[PDB]
Amino acid sequence: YLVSAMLLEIPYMAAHESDARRRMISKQFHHQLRVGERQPLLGPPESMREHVVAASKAMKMGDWKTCHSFIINEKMNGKVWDLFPEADKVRTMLVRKIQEESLRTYLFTYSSVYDSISMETLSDMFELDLPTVHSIISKMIINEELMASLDQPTQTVVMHRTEPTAQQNLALQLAEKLGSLVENNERVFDH
């Protein structure tokens, strides 16, 4: 359950802190996590929930090289790894999804700092072949509301954006539109 949650909710919350925050919904793991995330004493992990928290912090920093022990070593330590003959399939799926999202949890934050990208460095950083990486970036820019442009045949990507201070513009835009579209309910009560 928690790895099926992690391998969606972290690139999803990285998009929310790229101000795509209107997709937030209650009962998701963020409220459950808070009772541990509020505590200062967060030393090295020694429980399956703490191994998910350490994998979550590494993934919330965009890192799949540290996560190799959370995928393998800690599943062996918890005696969870051995329980399926399909664990060899799960290992491959985990690695491929973790490569896709350790890219995206970097992209959603680094979008203020980008300008253009070498697709060769993506295949060296995230292991995936260029035929596969061509689909992966296309599936993002078609759907996830980012401002990039893609050059698959010249092994290249583009963004050219401005204003890294946009979080104030966007937070006040939300503060004001949840004014004008909330304000009208008082008139509908009055009539």
């Binding site: 919350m13 929310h16 802190e17 963020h30 808070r34 995330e37 509020r38 505590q39 200062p40 004493l41 967060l42 030393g43 090295p44 020694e46 912090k57 919330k60 920093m61 051995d82 329980l83």
Partner: protein, 260 residues
């Protein structure tokens, strides 16, 4: 094979586990009703240290109750004055046994068994005396606190709070060697080389534990750590090296690193 454990526990539950529960219950019956200084005489401290050693030798599960019971014994006597029971304020053989001699082994047992929250509760167990037992002098050979606590405060706090603990150790042990009599040359350069070099290592305990929800009054979480080092706010950047290099530190430090 989906839920079945390997056979070692399966034989030891058949023949051993009733006996480890009997030892736990045997230590737990006498050091509550009878043996502790809720009265005025027969010293329990030879026995009180052994239950933590038992958690490491057999099974760690008993430490959580141990600690809360050793804390309950501490809470029953500090200011309660329930009877003529021996005061913490002058009787040094008893008082320093209640401050140090169980709690050194509590901290060592907690960090050896990876119990980081219980280890921090065991630095709060002494700090809850350092705020209350204020009229006696400092406990004997004070350096035995600061040189040990550095390794738990590294993993539970940070490398920066560890290096600031080496500053507190330095400014104390600069004078305390007048009672801790020594002529060893090897400790002089070693004390300073660790205390200046380990400072720059990490400012970025980054706000990813905060940003996904509301702001709160969370300044507490910096203040609590800093309070154990004696500050209202945590340690502050390259000035921590400048406060050392103000003195002969750049000449006490080892010749291979002097110019760094």
């Amino acid at each position: 094979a989906v839920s079945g454990e390997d056979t070692q526990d399966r034989t030891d539950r058949l023949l051993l586990t009733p006996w480890v529960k009997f030892l736990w219950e045997s230590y737990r019956q006498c050091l509550d009703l009878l043996r502790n200084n809720s009265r005025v005489e027969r010293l329990y401290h030879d026995i009180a240290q052994q239950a933590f050693k038992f958690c490491l030798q057999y099974t760690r599960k008993a430490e959580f109750r141990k600690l809360c019971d050793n804390l309950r014994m501490h809470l029953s006597q500090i200011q309660r004055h329930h009877n003529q029971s021996t005061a913490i304020n002058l009787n040094n053989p008893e008082s320093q046994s209640m401050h140090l001699e169980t709690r050194l082994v509590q901290l060592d047992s907690a960090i050896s068994m990876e119990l980081w929250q219980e280890a921090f509760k065991a630095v709060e167990d002494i700090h809850g005396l350092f705020s209350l037992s204020k009229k006696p002098p400092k406990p004997q050979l004070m350096a035995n606190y600061y040189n040990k606590v550095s390794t738990v405060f590294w993993k539970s706090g940070n490398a920066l709070f560890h290096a600031s603990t080496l500053h507190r150790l330095y400014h104390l042990s600069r004078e305390m060697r007048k009672n801790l009599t020594q002529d060893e040359m090897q400790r002089m350069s070693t004390r300073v080389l660790l205390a200046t070099l380990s400072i720059p290592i990490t400012p970025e305990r980054t706000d990813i534990a905060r940003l996904l929800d509301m702001d709160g009054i969370i300044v507490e979480k910096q203040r609590r750590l800093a309070t154990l080092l004696g500050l209202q706010a945590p340690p502050t950047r390259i000035g921590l090296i400048n406060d050392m290099v103000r003195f002969n530190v750049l000449q006490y430090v080892v010749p291979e690193v002097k110019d760094l």
